[PDB]
């Protein structure tokens, strides 16, 4: 109605660019390094913890079967 927001010309170019980054993206050898890390390194990275330890962690009330405290003190002398 009364244009309560004092529109800034250079803000619009900023928002217009930030909403259209995908147009100017090019699949070079650097974008290929970041795609690999984020989609094939990390997902496979957690793809081994999620399977090397799946069904191998019986932690519910895991009792203690080992002494903790030393019984015989041997001085260095």
């Amino acid at each position: 109605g009364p244009h309560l927001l004092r529109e800034d010309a250079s803000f619009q170019r900023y928002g217009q660019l930030r909403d259209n980054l995908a147009t100017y993206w090019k699949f070079n050898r650097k974008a290929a390094r970041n795609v690999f890390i984020f989609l094939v390194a990390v997902p496979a990275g957690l793809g081994y913890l999620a399977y090397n330890y799946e069904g191998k962690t019986p932690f519910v009330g895991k009792r203690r079967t080992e002494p903790i405290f030393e019984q015989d003190y041997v001085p260095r002398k």
Binding site: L5, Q12, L39, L46
Partner: protein, 491 residues
């Protein structure tokens, strides 16, 4: 008679709103009483009906037993069996409550065609409500894709500048994916000769045929709830869709996928779910971590909240795929909690700020607490609720889902705790910026929050706190129903 009353009433209501408005087209100029005051006499009818639908489920609620195992209120209408259990009762109840708030949110910020808008909202609300109370895979699909027809037209007619881009995204992403679910639904109808829930819950399939069915159904779920890497449609849709569309989309529609896991995967593909559960956790946890880092480097106001909803829907999927009652109950509570906080944020961001200043760039706004104190109060409170504050309902969902994951997989499920830290960064950085430093020089001082906008926030905040302080209103109903999904043999 729930469904029979529910469909017939809305169909009667749709015809009533059709008759009163479209009778005056004729050859005469629109000098009519009904359209006086922006069709106020045709909006009020639409708002009354959405309130009445809430009264229909309550009539069948008082008869609902919280202890009997199985589907209740089993009724046959249109040769389809409709039933209600513990999980379907709360999701239907939540869906209908968001009806009136969706209409009331766009009460005075449309350029015209309020009668069309009202009918579109009601059809979306009823079809969503009916989706939780069906009893076969085929009927689940019908109400899982019928919403596309009103939703595609609602966004295009009542959208933002990029509505054309978003109207395609909602229509094609939810059809090119759900079709992959039609294949798996059809395979059940071929080898079993029925898609009824109870019939297919008791049948075990070969180890391979469960995987082929799981993939076909998980594809239609991983898209409906935005899960990486097919999440690239919701942020566009949320930015362009109207306030009524954004409230329903992230309030109920995205929770259909969580409910879709309950009906379509856990009971009948129980073995293969245990095989896929480690895979789901890697996909979900990276969705949580990425969708919270991506939100840091955003600029658009409504897109920022759009990615926030994705993170809190990754926590739901992590919890639901846990094989214990702790994970499953918290995942369902979080869906209920996220069914009020997420719509509330779109009212603050895209329903109050946008409706006055007509822009969505985070660079303009800052220090709004100087001349909009009431807006800040609900901005801070709904920000702390959305981050997992203990007194909110998000925490109860977020604690139990995180705890439920740890029980299933203590190692990778520990990374689910990242939601506690990550949700604080992108969210408060928005709340800190919107309410910090001197009042912005680009914004003129305008009216503060009005009575209508206050009402929505107060009735979207109270259910969130009530569930947070005392979630036994919700847990008690779910405890029997959620205990059926669990698959384990202990010797």
């Amino acid at each position: 008679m729930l469904v029979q009353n529910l469909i017939i009433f809305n169909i009667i209501g749709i015809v009533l709103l059709v008759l009163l408005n479209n009778n005056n087209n004729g050859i005469l100029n629109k000098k009519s009483l009904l359209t006086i005051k922006n069709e106020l006499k045709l909006k009020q009818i639409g708002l009354i009906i959405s309130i009445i639908n809430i009264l229909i489920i309550i009539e069948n609620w008082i008869g609902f037993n919280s202890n009997y195992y199985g589907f209740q209120n089993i009724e046959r209408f249109l040769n389809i069996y409709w039933g209600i259990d513990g999980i379907s009762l709360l999701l239907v109840l939540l869906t209908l409550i968001l009806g009136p708030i969706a209409i009331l949110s766009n009460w005075k910020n449309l350029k015209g065609y309020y009668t069309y808008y009202v009918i579109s909202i009601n059809m979306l609300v009823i079809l969503m409500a009916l989706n939780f109370i069906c009893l076969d895979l085929v009927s689940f699909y019908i109400l899982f894709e019928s919403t596309l027809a009103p939703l595609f037209l609602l966004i295009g007619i009542y959208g933002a500048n990029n509505k054309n881009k978003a109207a395609y995204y909602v229509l094609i992403y939810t059809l090119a994916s759900s079709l992959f679910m039609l294949l798996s639904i059809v395979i059940y109808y071929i080898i079993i000769n029925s898609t009824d829930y109870i019939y297919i819950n008791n049948i075990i399939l070969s180890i391979n045929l469960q995987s082929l069915l799981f993939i076909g159904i998980i594809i239609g779920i991983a898209v409906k709830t935005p899960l990486m890497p097919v999440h690239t449609w919701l942020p566009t849709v949320h930015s362009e869709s109207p306030l009524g569309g954004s409230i329903l989309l992230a309030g109920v529609i995205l929770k259909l996928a969580i409910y879709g896991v309950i009906r379509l995967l856990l009971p009948n593909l129980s073995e293969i779910s245990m095989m896929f559960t480690p895979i789901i956790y890697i996909i979900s946890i990276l969705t949580l971590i990425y969708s919270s880092l991506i939100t840091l480097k955003q600029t658009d106001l409504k897109v920022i909240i759009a990615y926030s909803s994705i993170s809190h829907l990754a926590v739901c999927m992590i919890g639901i795929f846990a094989n214990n009652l702790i994970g499953i109950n918290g995942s369902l509570i979080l869906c209920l909690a996220h069914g009020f906080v997420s719509p509330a944020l779109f009212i603050l961001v895209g329903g109050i700020l946008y409706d006055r200043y007509h822009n969505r760039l985070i660079n303009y706004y800052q220090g709004l607490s100087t001349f909009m104190p009431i807006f800040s109060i609900y901005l801070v409170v709904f920000s702390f609720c959305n981050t997992g504050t203990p007194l909110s309902g998000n925490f109860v969902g977020e604690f139990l889902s995180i705890t439920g994951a740890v029980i299933r997989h203590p190692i990778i499920g520990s990374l689910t705790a990242a939601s506690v830290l990550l949700s604080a960064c992108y969210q408060m950085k928005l709340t800190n910026r919107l309410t910090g430093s001197v009042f912005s020089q680009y914004l003129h001082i305008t009216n503060d929050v009005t009575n209508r906008e206050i009402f929505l926030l107060n009735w979207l905040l109270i259910p969130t706190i009530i569930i947070g302080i005392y979630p036994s209103f919700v847990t008690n109903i779910l405890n029997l129903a959620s205990s059926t999904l669990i698959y384990s043999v202990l010797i």
